[PDB]
Design a protein around this ligand. Structure first.
Ligand SMILES: Nc1cccnc1-n1cccc1
Ligand SMILES: Nc1cccnc1-n1cccc1
Ligand SMILES: [Cl-]
Ligand SMILES: [Zn+2]
Ligand SMILES: [Zn+2]
Length: 568
C-alpha cells in the first residue's frame, strides 16, 4: 500500500501545501481518499454536414445526439480458488501461444516522437515537449526510479479516460507498446483477435466463424468491463513479463506493479477541490494497452466459459489435481481450434461454441466478475441463429450480391447513428476549411463502408461535391483518409486486397456497386419513400451550391452524375 503510492502522494501534497485538507464529507467508499486541494468540453455541430442532410433536422434521434459515478465506485469480490487456478493455467498457456511467433521488445523515443507528430491519441502540446530535452531528463529520472522499484510522477487524471502527463505515457509506451505496434492481437497471431483487421473485414470474419459446426453464436456484453477487472486479472496480465529480459522485463514489471496494480488518481469534485484517491483493482491504463489487455483477459474468460460448457471441470469451488491435467490437455489439444471460434475486440466478443451447453455455463463467468449486461445473473444467454443478425463493434453485417454474382459482406448500423455522429465536431477554433475537411472524411468513410445505404451514398456524393476537390480529409484501418479517387480505393479494398474475393475483375463505375434491398434499407433507418427525402434528393445541387457559396471561389468537382438518377 502506502510505501508504493506515498511518494507520488507526498509530492502532490507540497505543490498545494497551502490548500491541503483531509475533507470529512468525501464521497468515496471503494476508492481510498488521501486529501483535497483548491482548483478550477461539449459536442459542436459540423455545419457543412448539417446543411447537406436537411431531412434529418426534424429527426430527434439525430438532433438529440448533439445536445447535453454508480459503477466506478463499486467493488468486485475475490474469485474462488478453482476460478483463480482456471485463469492462471489459461493465462500462462495464452501468453505462450501469443509469444510463439513474436518477440517482446522496447518501443523507442524515436517511435514515440513519430506517433506524437501523426496526431495519435496519446510545454503546450506533446510536439513541443518531444522536441525539448529537459522532458527527456525528467523521463530519465522517473525511468531510473522505476528501475529502483519506486514512482514519483505516474498519476492518473479522471474525466472513463485516465489522462497522464506525456512522460508517464512514454514509460507505458516504452515497455508495453509492442503489444499494439507488433500486432499481438492480429487475427493471424491470436486467432480470436481482430486488431488491425478493419470494418470491411469484420463481416467476412463473422461469416467464417459461422461455417464451424456448433451451436448458436453468442454475443453477451459485460456490464462495465473496465470496473470488473480484478487484481487476479492484473496478475495474469503481468505474466507477459515472464517472456521478456534485461531492462525491458524490469521496466514492464514496474508499469504493472507501480501504475496498474497500484493507482493514484486526481478527480474534479464540484463541492471545486481535487481528490487524490488510490485503489489497486479495475482497468486504468492508456487506451491502446487497455484495448490489448481487455482483448487478452476476454479471450481467457471466453475459453474458460467454453471449458465449463464442455464439462472440462466440474466446479469452480476447487480444481482437483487431475482436473488441472485435463484443462492443460484441453488447451494443448483443442485450444487453438477454440480460439478460432471467437471474434474478440477488447471487451466485445462473439463465440460459436461446440454446442449450446455454453448458454447456461455461467458459474466461472459470474465468479470472474464478468457479469452479463441486461439479463438476470443465472438466466441462460440468448444466442443468434444467423451471423447476419449478430451485433459486433457497434455494427451488424449484410451479404450483398453484385449484379456480376460476386459476394460483398458489408458493415451496417442504424442510419440515424451514422448521420448524427457525422454532424458533430469535437474541439474549439475550427476554421471553415477544417470543418469542411472533417465533413469530407465522414463522406469518404460512407462511400467506402456504407455505399450500400441509398441516403449515405447520395449525401457522401453531395459533401464531396461541396468541398474543394483537392482539400485533404482531416480528423483531429482508415483507407478513406486520402485524396485518391474513391472508386480506385473502393476497387483496392473490396476486390484487389479482399482475400474472400477470387475474381479480381475491377469495377469501372459506381453504378456496378449494389445497394441493400429497398425494404432492408428502410429497416436499417433509410428515409427512402418520405417526401422530405424526395425533395432533398431532387434539389441536392441547390444544397451543394449553398455550401460552395459559403466556402467561396475554389475548384469543385461534381460527383452527383456518378449516380444513375443524376446521369441525365
Ligand atoms: N501505441 C500506443 C502505445 C501506448 C500508448 N499509446 C499508444 N497510442 C495511442 C494512440 C496511438 C498510439
Ligand atoms: N469501428 C467502429 C466502431 C464504432 C463506430 N464507428 C466505427 N467505424 C465506422 C467506420 C469505421 C469504423
Ligand atoms: Cl437470429
Ligand atoms: Zn512512475
Ligand atoms: Zn443493416
Amino acid at each position: 500500500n502506502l510505501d508504493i503510492i506515498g511518494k507520488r502522494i507526498e509530492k502532490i501534497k507540497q505543490e498545494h501545501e497551502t490548500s491541503w485538507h483531509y475533507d470529512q464529507d468525501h464521497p468515496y467508499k471503494t476508492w481510498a481518499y488521501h486529501g483535497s486541494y483548491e482548483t478550477k468540453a461539449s459536442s459542436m455541430v459540423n455545419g457543412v454536414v448539417r446543411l447537406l442532410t436537411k431531412p434529418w433536422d426534424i429527426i430527434p434521434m439525430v438532433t438529440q445526439m448533439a445536445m447535453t459515478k454508480e459503477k466506478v465506485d463499486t467493488r468486485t469480490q475475490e474469485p474462488k480458488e478453482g476460478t483463480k487456478k482456471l485463469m492462471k493455467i489459461t493465462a500462462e498457456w495464452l501468453w505462450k501461444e501469443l509469444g510463439k511467433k513474436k518477440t517482446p521488445r522496447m518501443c523507442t523515443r524515436e517511435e514515440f516522437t513519430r506517433k506524437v507528430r501523426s496526431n495519435a491519441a496519446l510545454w503546450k502540446s506533446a510536439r513541443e515537449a518531444v522536441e525539448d530535452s529537459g522532458f527527456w531528463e525528467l523521463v530519465d529520472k522517473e525511468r531510473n526510479l522505476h528501475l529502483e522499484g519506486k514512482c514519483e510522477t505516474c498519476v492518473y487524471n479522471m474525466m472513463a479516460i485516465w489522462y497522464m502527463w506525456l512522460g508517464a505515457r512514454f514509460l507505458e509506451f516504452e515497455a508495453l507498446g509492442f503489444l499494439n505496434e507488433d500486432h499481438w492481437f492480429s487475427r493471424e497471431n491470436s486467432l480470436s483477435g481482430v486488431e488491425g483487421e478493419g470494418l470491411h473485414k469484420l463481416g467476412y470474419i463473422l461469416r467464417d466463424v459461422s461455417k464451424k459446426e456448433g451451436g448458436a453464436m453468442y454475443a453477451d456484453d459485460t456490464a462495465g468491463w473496465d470496473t470488473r477487472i480484478t487484481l487476479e486479472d492484473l496478475k495474469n496480465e503481468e505474466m507477459v513479463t515472464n517472456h521478456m529480459e534485461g531492462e525491458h522485463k524490469k521496466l514492464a514489471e514496474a508499469i504493472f506493479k507501480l501504475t496498474y496494480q497500484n493507482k493514484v488518481v486526481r478527480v474534479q469534485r464540484p463541492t471545486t477541490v481535487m481528490d487524490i484517491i488510490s485503489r489497486r483493482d479495475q482497468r486504468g491504463s492508456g487506451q491502446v494497452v487497455t484495448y490489448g489487455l481487455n482483448t487478452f483477459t476476454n479471450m481467457e474468460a471466453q475459453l474458460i466459459r467454453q471449458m465449463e460448457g464442455e464439462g472440462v471441470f466440474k466446479s469452480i469451488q476447487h480444481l482437483t489435481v487431475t482436473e488441472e491435467i485435463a484443462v492443460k490437455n484441453w488447451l494443448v489439444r483443442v485450444g487453438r481450434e477454440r480460439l478460432s471460434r471467437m471474434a474478440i475486440s477488447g471487451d466485445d466478443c462473439v463465440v460459436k461454441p461446440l454446442d449450446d451447453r455454453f448458454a447456461s455455463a455461467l458459474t466461472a463467468l459470474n465468479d470472474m466478475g464478468k457479469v452479463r449486461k441486461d439479463i438476470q445473473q443465472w438466466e441462460p444467454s440468448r444466442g443468434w441463429n444467423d451471423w447476419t443478425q449478430v451485433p459486433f463493434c457497434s455494427h451488424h453485417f449484410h451479404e450483398l450480391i453484385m449484379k456480376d454474382g460476386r459476394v460483398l459482406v458489408v458493415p451496417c448500423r442504424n442510419q440515424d447513428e451514422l448521420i448524427g455522429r457525422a454532424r458533430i465536431s469535437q474541439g474549439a477554433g475550427w476554421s471553415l476549411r477544417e470543418t469542411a475537411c472533417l465533413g469530407k472524411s465522414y463522406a469518404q468513410m460512407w462511400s467506402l463502408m456504407y455505399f450500400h445505404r441509398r441516403d449515405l451514398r447520395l449525401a457522401a456524393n453531395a459533401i464531396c461535391s461541396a468541398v474543394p476537390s483537392h482539400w485533404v480529409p482531416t480528423s483531429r484501418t482508415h483507407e478513406w483518409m486520402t485524396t485518391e479517387d474513391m472508386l480506385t480505393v473502393w476497387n483496392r479494398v473490396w476486390i484487389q486486397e479482399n482475400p474472400w474475393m477470387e475474381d479480381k475483375t475491377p469495377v469501372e463505375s459506381w453504378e456496378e456497386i449494389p445497394y441493400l434491398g429497398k425494404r432492408e434499407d428502410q429497416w436499417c433507418g433509410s428515409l427512402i419513400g418520405l417526401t422530405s427525402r424526395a425533395t432533398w434528393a431532387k434539389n441536392i445541387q441547390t444544397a451543394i451550391n449553398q455550401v460552395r457559396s459559403l466556402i467561396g471561389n475554389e475548384e469543385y468537382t461534381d460527383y452527383m452524375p456518378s449516380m444513375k438518377r443524376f446521369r441525365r
